[PDB]
Design a protein around this ligand. Sequence first.
Ligand SMILES: NC1=[SH]c2cc(CNC(=O)c3cc4ccccc4[nH]3)ccc2N1
Ligand SMILES: NC1=[SH]c2cc(CNC(=O)c3cc4ccccc4[nH]3)ccc2N1
Ligand SMILES: [K+]
Ligand SMILES: [K+]
Ligand SMILES: [Mg+2]
Ligand SMILES: [Mg+2]
Ligand SMILES: [Mg+2]
Ligand SMILES: [Mg+2]
Ligand SMILES: [Mg+2]
Ligand SMILES: [Mg+2]
Ligand SMILES: [Mg+2]
Ligand SMILES: [Mg+2]
Ligand SMILES: [Mg+2]
Ligand SMILES: [Mg+2]
Ligand code: NA
Ligand code: NA
Lengths: 725, 715
Amino acid sequence: YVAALFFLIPLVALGFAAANFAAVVRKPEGTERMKEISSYIRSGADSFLAHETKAIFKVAIVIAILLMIFTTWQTGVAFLLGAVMSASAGIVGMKMATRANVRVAEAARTTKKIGPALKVAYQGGSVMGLSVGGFALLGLVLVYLIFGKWMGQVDNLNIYTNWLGINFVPFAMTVSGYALGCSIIAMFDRVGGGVYTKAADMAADLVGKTELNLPEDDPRNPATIADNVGDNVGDVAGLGADLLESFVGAIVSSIILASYMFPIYVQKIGENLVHQVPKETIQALISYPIFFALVGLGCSMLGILYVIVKKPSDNPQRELNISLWTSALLTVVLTAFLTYFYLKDLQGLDVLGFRFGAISPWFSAIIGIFSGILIGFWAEYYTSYRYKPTQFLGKSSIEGTGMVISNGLSLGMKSVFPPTLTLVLGILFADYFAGLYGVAIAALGMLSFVATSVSVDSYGPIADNAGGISEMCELDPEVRKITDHLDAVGNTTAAIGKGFAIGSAIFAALSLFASYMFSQISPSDIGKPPSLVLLLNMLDARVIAGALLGAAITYYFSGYLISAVTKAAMKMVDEIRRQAREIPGLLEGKAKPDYNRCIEITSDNALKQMGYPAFIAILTPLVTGFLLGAEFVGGVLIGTVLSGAMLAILTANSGGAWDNAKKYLEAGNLEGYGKGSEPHKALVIGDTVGDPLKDTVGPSLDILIKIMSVVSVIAVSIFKHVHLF
Amino acid sequence: YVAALFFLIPLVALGFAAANFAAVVRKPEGTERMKEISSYIRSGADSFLAHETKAIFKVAIVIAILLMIFTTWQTGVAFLLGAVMSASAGIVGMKMATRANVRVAEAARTTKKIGPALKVAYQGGSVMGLSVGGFALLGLVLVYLIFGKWMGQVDNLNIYTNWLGINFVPFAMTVSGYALGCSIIAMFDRVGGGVYTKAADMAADLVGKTELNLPEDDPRNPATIADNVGDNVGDVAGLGADLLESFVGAIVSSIILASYMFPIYVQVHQVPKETIQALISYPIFFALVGLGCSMLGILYVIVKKPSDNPQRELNISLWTSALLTVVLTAFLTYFYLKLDVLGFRFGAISPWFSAIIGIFSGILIGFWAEYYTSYRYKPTQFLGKSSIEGTGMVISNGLSLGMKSVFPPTLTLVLGILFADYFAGLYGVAIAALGMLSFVATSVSVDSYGPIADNAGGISEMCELDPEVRKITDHLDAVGNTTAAIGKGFAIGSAIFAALSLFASYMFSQISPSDIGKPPSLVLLLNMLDARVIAGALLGAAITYYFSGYLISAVTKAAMKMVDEIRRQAREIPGLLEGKAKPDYNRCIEITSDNALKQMGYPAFIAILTPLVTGFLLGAEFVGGVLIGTVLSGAMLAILTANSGGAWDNAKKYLEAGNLEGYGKGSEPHKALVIGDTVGDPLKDTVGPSLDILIKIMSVVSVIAVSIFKHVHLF
Ligand SMILES: NC1=[SH]c2cc(CNC(=O)c3cc4ccccc4[nH]3)ccc2N1
Ligand SMILES: NC1=[SH]c2cc(CNC(=O)c3cc4ccccc4[nH]3)ccc2N1
Ligand SMILES: [K+]
Ligand SMILES: [K+]
Ligand SMILES: [Mg+2]
Ligand SMILES: [Mg+2]
Ligand SMILES: [Mg+2]
Ligand SMILES: [Mg+2]
Ligand SMILES: [Mg+2]
Ligand SMILES: [Mg+2]
Ligand SMILES: [Mg+2]
Ligand SMILES: [Mg+2]
Ligand SMILES: [Mg+2]
Ligand SMILES: [Mg+2]
Ligand code: NA
Ligand code: NA
């Protein structure tokens, strides 16, 4: 029927991405030096991503075997499917960007205008965004059809108990495994690529600009190629992995709640269970988020096509915002129709959530979108150098490096507010509209047009690489100005994407707190009213202690990521100093440096440090539970949500502001002081201090939130009574 | 009987502090240049503290009148009493330090050893700590005797409702007003002094060391005198205010919970009135025993043979005070309390155990502080080493060190909460919150010891003395920074415990006389799955972060103003850098004073209003969520900022001791460490301390005012 037409949308999106790749590759590349630089960066990125993928997939096979042992095999199969999906999205994005960077560079060089370069960069971004959306929805639909339909886990959806004494719902456990695989692979990719790129960027920027007195991404700098390999590895593949994980997480949270609703909402009447809701309603609610995501992917495809066929403009932010708005409006309308018709007459919504009938979920979704948009706007206010905060930061740059650091930290901590209030209002409204199911539907709708968001976000790194390639090949300063404008727009878009991701994570984390309080129910007491089930008393000393511990664990995770970055940062700083002083004629320009040193340093550090964060995110719930019950784990989840949201928003805004103020000063817009002045060095120090907090901690925080919440939701059935205290 | 002997302890502490002040003043000060510099610094500190005190006391009178209007007059009277108590403790500490700085400096200069300077600095610190403890306990005992005994508010312990629809217990409301006044005055003092001193320090350090290439606190630097006046204003008066506020807040939380326990635990009252009265009076006797043990430890450490390692002497003081407190409080709990229905599961000794936790917790925190802040350990030394790689490296490694150190103390607090709960419910949780500050006198002493050493070093460097004097001052100042970090940890831990206890008291206060029968098991219930509660938690975390950011910005404004002023002076006054001209310290003094006085008001009003607005907007669950998020985020940020600022400052000092191989005071690593120290100053001396004050003030205001918007909410 129409379900098949909907389920074929992800394949159309993947085909569109492949077509965009074929079109960009058919574009003309640059000169011979441009080809050589692109080859260097592409080879580095390919090698590091190959090593990362091998390691991550070994770990993924191990985790899949464990999941198969301790739960149903369907869980392990879904885990592997999600791992493959996220890894493939990341690899596709990286393999597309490694080729589109030089294309954008050559376009901006020949045409001397922003239109063509913007168009090619948006083509690459669309490749990655369509790949992400299509992979996520394809994995989800394959799971829903094989383990939900072919095997019929969506038909029984009952509370079984496995051999290890674990209470589980079949389709619930399968989607949990799928989301866990997605999020764990995304965690590995993000941590690795972030460590790599941020160490390289810190070392190169700091040493070169502040000490050696070189231009940004100068060929004499033995770390520039490492920096660009990181831009392609950590800022692309990791970005796609994280965003696909967020999309799949919102959708799987909605689906898990819908599935768990059926066997719990029952009435015990003389030892006879009477289901308060018909199975058809739960099945409609389960299939609803998938159709929602498919309609959203279609609307994103429409907007991306309109923006890639439209006449190019000189203001790239205008084009990106036009794409986002068109996708969002198409999604709103088509999803209104989908919610009205699909949920027409179900007869069981009143019992759970929806108070305004079939349209109740749609409203929630709307909230999400709007919420996201709001955050987006706020991002552009705090990150863009065309507004008050970033400009005041750039001005304060005249007073000293310490002034820059303090003002950046204050700007981040202040910007923490408006988006948090947006999320508060969104939570309240989605609740009022359709309970926790609508909370999850809003989490999803905030990313309903995830394809366009991922596209507009990945657009940036391509422009950054184009600028790096133009600087390495000594191009016309007009090319550098085009790349700098595109890169500022890309920083704004990356801040917007981080905000979107963190908001979706918070919404899905509330929905998952609900599902986690649900999973604790055993078949023995499968009759108590959900009003008593969904209860996590905060006055229980265990819960508040767990909240404290979760906040501390989030902060320690961020600190460990920062330290893992700074280790390689210092190593490469020292290596660059050594090369500058021990290689004859390197600074004069008559000698070639050794980029391989920094490449290998960053690769080794990233490969060594990428493992611990994922394992922490996987184990923390299990250990905390087996030590102090399930209320402590609930408190830990609460504290994790709070601290992670706060730190992620703060770091995203602060890093965006710092980088855009550095770029604004580099454009000479700072009266009197140029690109080589002491204020520029202070802004460079600020940008290096913002780099690791913007490209590592922030993104990884939401992945940690979702991974930990999913692990707890899956494993609470055990430590609920197998605790030590 | 023996109760009068107990009620006389705070007066003895105040007398001991006055005697220590008279003894330090009887010591010989330095030369004419030292006398002139000390007089200038004392005049500046006195002037700024006078203005700050006048403004804060006008605001305090206004707030007391408002409290009298909307609640009982006893609340306003106790508010004024606590305001006066905290302001007096701070002013006494500051007036003692402004005179003890030059005395410590001259002692360390003449003796050429660390012993005499350490002894005099600890004398000043003991003056301030005894002042704080004595004033806090005297105000609290006067309230307990006048409104608790003379008027007998501890006799009825009923749930009344005032004309504005507020449910309250008489003595509960009175102690709430006292603690609220204490915390609001501490908030004003802390915010003002922190802005002042941190702006001055940022300006001076950055401009002088990074640009003009001058030594720390050089007379040519027109901000060194302003920086030291700030050290005396914000790091002394504010410190005493904050610590007295935490002490009184723990005790008042204990008292409020004890009072509210009676009329709620009914089936017929589940607990006899005598038991509730004994539990109400118990925290006061506990605090008195703790003050006595702190006095004993301070006396032993000021009479004990001086050592060359001052941290050893300070740790010996802390250990002796803590052990004396543990033993004497064990005896007090055994005899005075010579329960099962509420909390205590091990009989009369149940509360004492909890207190122990607190103490030990504090002690534990102490070690962790000394592990992360002292340059004699791995983290601070690694930071100093990373200083060779660049300023950005210093900043990133400092942030990482703070965020990691955030953990061990958090786990300590988690275990303490869990164990105190297991032992004696929320009453024992609050008693542990208090016991962590049981020896608050010794803690305040060891903490105020630091700023005195900082001022002595600044004065010795201003007069160009013997480098041995500067080395003595640097060692003492590093020890003082470590002790200040330990004190901040003490405050934040006590704040977390008391904030949980106040969450309990706030869930209790919502009970109205109409439904004064529901089982307490159902009353103490704040479901976290309520969308409103989680939204409020998110909003509270965001509000804490914005509070911190606004404080940082208030600091950076005056910091930039003074940086520009110093550059202008350097370029337009002939011979200033050459040394043939005299700078204008009054300019920086006035800049920082004006900025601090202007920015000093808003944070306290935010902390006071946020609960009221959030409540009248979204019921009581939203306010509960806001309190939870605020507590969590504030604890995290306070621990992080304290540890990070300590690490940065001690790494700078570790590089100053030459322990960094090859690089001296003028090398790029020293400039990077100075940039790190300037970035840490505002996060260490302004945000961190204000966070726990905000937590306590907001939770107390909520506990008092929830009775209105609990059902008079807009949604
Ligand atoms: N129009 C309608 S009535 C209706 C009823 C149900 C199932 N049980 C109930 O609501 C139910 C209400 C209630 C109140 C007190 C005690 C026990 C109770 N049990 C589900 C859908 C539906 N739709
Ligand atoms: N419209 C209506 S109210 C109503 C009430 C009753 C009798 N008690 C119940 O059903 C009932 C038991 C139970 C246990 C847990 C959660 C919810 C529950 N509900 C039966 C039918 C009916 N139909
Ligand atoms: K970027
Ligand atoms: K200090
Ligand atoms: Mg850079
Ligand atoms: Mg880059
Ligand atoms: Mg670049
Ligand atoms: Mg950038
Ligand atoms: Mg950068
Ligand atoms: Mg300083
Ligand atoms: Mg000082
Ligand atoms: Mg000083
Ligand atoms: Mg100091
Ligand atoms: Mg300082
Ligand atoms: Na995410
Ligand atoms: Na405090």
